[PDB]
Ligand binder design. Structure first.
Ligand code: F3S
Ligand code: ZN
Ligand code: ZN
Lengths: 176, 58, 86, 66, 261, 98, 122, 90
């Protein structure tokens, strides 16, 4: 009886949202945010081998689709690799944590990647930072994603997509 | 504070009552919404619902 | 609207739903029953795990348990809710 | 206590280069030239040789009476 | 798919590989460390010890001493085989020393080996310093082993695989000679000639100052493989044994994969 | 302070262009909040001390040699002045972009 | 089929806001002002040359000496002066089109179309 | 060194190998990415403290995944033999 109650009421993934306020207490940390920003930035292009190396840490297997850029050289992109995990009916429009300084464009027409635009599960512009995957950040895209696809999709996402951030961070160089 | 608020419970009619019988609140909070299930201290975000429905054409 | 509209909405919502505490209690009782006698009500060959907890969860999910819950309201009214789909 | 047999980072043997280096430096020769001509070029092995203390020469006086 | 040679020092070997994939070259580099067998001390039988060093420390120091395991790869059973009993796969060395009145340093030349073709690489490795009236008497057993099991069995010190550079001089900027840490460039009659192109590590620091006088690329199919041995085996033998280990592993995998299809 | 999270062999460590692998890896994210510039300064000074063989004194308010001199001497000895190095991945052999 | 094609010359190649970003501006016939983002590895254009661009759902034939990609049409805006702003996201790289009748208002395309965009040298 | 099959179809294979690490996994992945008809190939190390790898192969149906793995092994063996024969000449 004690084991059944512990499994049915006290599991970690069932308590992603804290009772103090409506917002996730389990979320991205410090290396995760930097990796997400570096992978999501506009200037990231990956080859087939790099994409395979990045996706080897997750459970994803299937069709990658056509590369984002076909000629002169076949290049993928960070947003295309990220978009393989978002549900196919998820929409989100909101600013990023880097939209505070001179990058504030306050609308979708932004020369920077300072505005997040997701339509039908496709990440079209914007970067991931503390305001999208960070912990203790209510009304973020992670919060809405969990709220609409259960702690089940919350746990699946946190287990899968959060490892590509670390893998890409160590694939690139991050020093001080 | 724990020793003060230890014996409060939510009944099947929505009221908040102590285990000794007396009534603390006629309905929990003001609309019987758990803070854990709320959208950041809010029953439902209507703007978020409108976005979820028609954001692919904005 | 007996006392408040919110209370009526609350009771209407919970009239035909099982709270997580009720689910946990049912699963605990069924798991304790299966641990000694009480042969399962399902086909225990396709199950991924042979432990009692998983069998209890599967039986609750399929809706074969002959268990009813009594909800006693503060004014004395009683409500019987059955978990079998039938 | 005593000079390690191998460099910690790379497995290069460095113990055999201690008694030359420890002597010629005491003879007035600058450590850099001696280290370069002894065959030590990676700065990990230079760190190994440059920061040895050699306590055992004091501990031989105070040894277990077993 | 030729292989070219850059330099051959006493223990260093540098090669250029021209039509091999990066995965194979990296596998050879890793197997040069992990899957090449050498002789090292496995166990020590202690009879007496009065030195400041304890038994475990002395055993570790003895184990870290490299032995010449060049002719022993053909007379001793490898670890992959049965190797833990059936004597005929263990070598034995002895050490019996004593100090009379003055402190005495014990070098690796004092280790007497039962089999004469297995000797320490260097005879001037200090092992332990003995005070007055202190003595040591021990027997050590040597056997083959792979660097995967313990790092004392690794036959190399550094194993390196890097890209093949291509440096071209377009202008005549004089800054590049004093910026490159590898000394690739030089000034000859004020022309900025490239002396040793293969020394560039693709640092890309000359691009920060010249930026128009120097262009840096990496050749897509050539790699530079540099290894340095410790003294037990010659570098060519190390490379051959690493590739043989790859061959054995691939053969076993294919044999037990195609069977039971 | 900190505990050991994992132990990595020499083959899996990210070797540099000269074959030097790190003995300890420290996360950059620990620096900007604690604001210990002395850590990086000591790293540079120690590398210079090992390369040159010259003594390094880090007494407060009277440090000799200065950072600029140490960096120039490091550059003169075959290494990059900013104490950075080109690093390859020990598991795949791919050159890191930074 | 709702293919769109044009021929026009490059105006400028600026530096952009990000680290190694670049923006290519093209002034074109019929009051088109194509302006698209590229990176260093994709820079095969000069300061001024004649090129041909095509936007179409059907995948066209391409070589290894021209630049093109596929993305989605996700932004349709009207300006206060009667102009239009159209944006195509090549999974992150932005192609902005300034026209008169618009790309969706003129019934050429609709919202969120998977389109191929190719630019070749003439 | 023991192999086992987690999943298997005509154009999909998931193979768990115990006793192996990056040395063989990276080589096999690099060789598989060169075999024609293979659409996806990857290897994973489930935990650094455990010496075991998992190889995932997905083809387009022209060639079976097991055949692709055998071809990759053949390519690797050919490269190793060529390397031995060329190193022996210097
Ligand atoms: S200046 Fe020097 S060492 Fe390397 S990349 Fe540039 S050459
Ligand atoms: Zn902006
Ligand atoms: Zn060293």
């Amino acid at each position: 009886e004690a084991i059944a109650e512990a499994r049915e009421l006290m599991l970690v993934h069932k308590n992603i949202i804290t009772p103090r306020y409506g917002g996730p207490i389990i979320g991205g940390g410090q290396d995760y945010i930097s990796g997400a920003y570096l992978l999501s930035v506009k200037t990231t292009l990956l080859t087939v081998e790099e994409v395979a190396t990045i996706l080897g840490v997750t459970d994803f297997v299937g069709e990658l689709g056509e590369p984002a850029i076909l000629a002169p050289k076949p290049y993928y992109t960070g947003k295309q690799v990220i978009s393989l995990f978002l549900p196919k009916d998820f929409n989100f429009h909101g600013p990023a944590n880097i939209s505070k300084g001179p990058r504030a464009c306050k609308d979708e027409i932004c020369p920077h990647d300072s505005f997040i635009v997701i339509k039908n599960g496709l990440l079209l512009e914007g970067v991931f930072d503390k305001k999208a995957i960070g912990n203790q950040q209510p009304e973020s895209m992670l919060h809405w994603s969990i709220r609409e696809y259960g702690t089940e999709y919350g746990k699946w996402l946190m287990d899968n997509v959060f490892k590509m951030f670390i893998r890409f961070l160590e694939m690139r160089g991050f020093t001080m | 504070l724990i020793n003060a608020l230890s014996d409060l419970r939510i009944e099947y009619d929505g009221t908040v009552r102590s285990l000794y019988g007396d009534i603390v609140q006629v309905v929990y909070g003001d609309d019987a919404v758990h803070p854990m299930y709320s959208a950041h201290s809010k029953s439902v975000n209507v703007n978020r619902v409108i976005e979820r429905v028609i954001g692919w054409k904005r | 609207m007996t006392i408040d509209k919110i209370n009526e909405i609350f009771k209407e919502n919970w009239k035909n739903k099982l709270t997580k505490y009720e689910i946990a209690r049912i699963i605990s009782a069924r798991a304790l029953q299966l641990s000694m006698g009480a042969l399962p009500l399902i086909d225990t060959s396709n199950l991924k795990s042979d432990d009692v907890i998983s069998i209890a969860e599967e039986e609750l999910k399929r809706g074969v348990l002959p268990i009813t819950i009594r909800r006693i309201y503060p004014n004395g009214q009683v409500e019987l809710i059955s978990v079998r789909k039938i | 206590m005593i000079i390690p047999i191998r460099c910690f980072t790379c497995g290069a043997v460095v113990a055999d280069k201690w008694e030359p280096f420890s002597n010629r430096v005491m003879g007035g020769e600058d450590p850099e030239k001696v280290l370069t001509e002894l065959g030590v070029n990676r700065y990990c092995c230079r760190r190994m040789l440059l920061s040895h203390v050699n306590i055992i020469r004091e501990i031989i006086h105070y040894t277990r009476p077993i | 798919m030729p292989i070219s040679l850059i330099e051959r020092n006493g223990l260093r070997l540098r090669l250029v590989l021209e039509n091999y994939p990066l995965e194979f070259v990296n596998s050879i580099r890793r197997a040069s460390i992990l899957y090449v067998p050498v002789m090292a001390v496995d166990e020590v039988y202690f009879i007496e010890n009065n030195s400041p060093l304890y038994d475990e420390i002395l055993a570790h120091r003895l184990a870290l001493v490299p032995f010449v395991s060049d002719e022993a790869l053909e007379h001793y059973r490898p670890p992959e085989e049965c190797a833990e009993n059936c004597d005929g796969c263990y070598n034995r060395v002895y050490l019996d020393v004593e100090a009379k009145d003055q402190p005495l340093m014990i070098y690796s030349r004092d280790l007497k080996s039962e089999d004469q073709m297995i000797t320490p690489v260097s005879g001037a490795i200090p092992i332990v310093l003995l005070g007055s009236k202190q003595k040591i008497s021990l027997e050590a057993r040597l056997r083959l082993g792979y660097g995967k099991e313990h790092i004392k069995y690794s036959p190399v010190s550094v194993s390196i695989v890097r890209y093949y550079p291509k440096v071209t001089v377009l202008g005549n900027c004089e800054k590049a000679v004093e910026v490159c840490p590898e000394g690739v460039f030089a000034m000859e009659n004020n022309k900025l000639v490239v002396k040793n192109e293969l020394s560039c590590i693709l640092c890309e620091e000359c691009l920060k100052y010249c930026a128009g006088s120097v262009s840096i690329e990496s050749v897509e199919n050539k790699f530079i493989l540099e290894i340095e041995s410790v003294g037990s085996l010659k570098p060519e033998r190390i490379l051959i044994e690493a590739s043989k280990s790859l061959l054995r592993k691939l053969s076993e995998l294919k044999s037990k994969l195609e069977a039971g299809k | 302070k900190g505990v050991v999270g994992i132990l990595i062999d020499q083959v899996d460590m990210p070797y540099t262009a000269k074959g030097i692998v790190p003995d300890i890896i420290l996360n950059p994210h620990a620096l900007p909040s604690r604001m210990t510039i002395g850590q990086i300064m000591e790293a540079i000074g120690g590398k210079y001390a090992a390369l040159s063989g010259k003594p390094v004194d880090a007494t407060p308010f009277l440090e000799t040699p200065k950072l600029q001199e140490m960096q120039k001497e490091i550059l003169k000895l075959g290494h990059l002045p900013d104490s950075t190095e080109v690093v390859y991945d020990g598991r795949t052999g791919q050159k890191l972009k930074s | 089929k709702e293919m769109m094609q044009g021929t026009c010359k490059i105006s400028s190649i600026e530096k952009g806001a990000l680290k190694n970003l670049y923006v290519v501006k093209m002034d074109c016939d019929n009051d088109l002002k194509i302006e698209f983002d590229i990176t260093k590895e994709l820079s095969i254009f000069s300061k001024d040359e004649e090129v041909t661009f095509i936007i179409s759902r059907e995948k066209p034939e391409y070589s290894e000496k021209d630049f093109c990609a596929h993305g989605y049409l996700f932004l349709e805006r009207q300006q206060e002066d009667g102009s239009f702003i159209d944006e195509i996201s090549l999974y992150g790289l932005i192609v902005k089109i300034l026209s008169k009748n618009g790309l969706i208002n003129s019934k050429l395309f609709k919202m969120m179309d998977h389109v191929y965009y190719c630019v070749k040298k003439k | 060194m023991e192999i086992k099959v987690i999943k298997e179809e005509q154009n999909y294979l998931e193979l768990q190998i115990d006793g192996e690490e990056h040395t063989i996994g990276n080589l096999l992945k690099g060789m598989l990415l060169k075999v024609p008809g293979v659409k996806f190939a990857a290897y994973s190390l489930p935990h650094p403290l455990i010496t075991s790898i998992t190889i995932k192969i997905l083809t387009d149906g022209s060639i079976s995944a097991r055949e692709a793995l055998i071809k990759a092994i053949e390519l690797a063996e050919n490269y190793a033999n060529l390397f031995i024969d060329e190193v022996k000449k210097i």
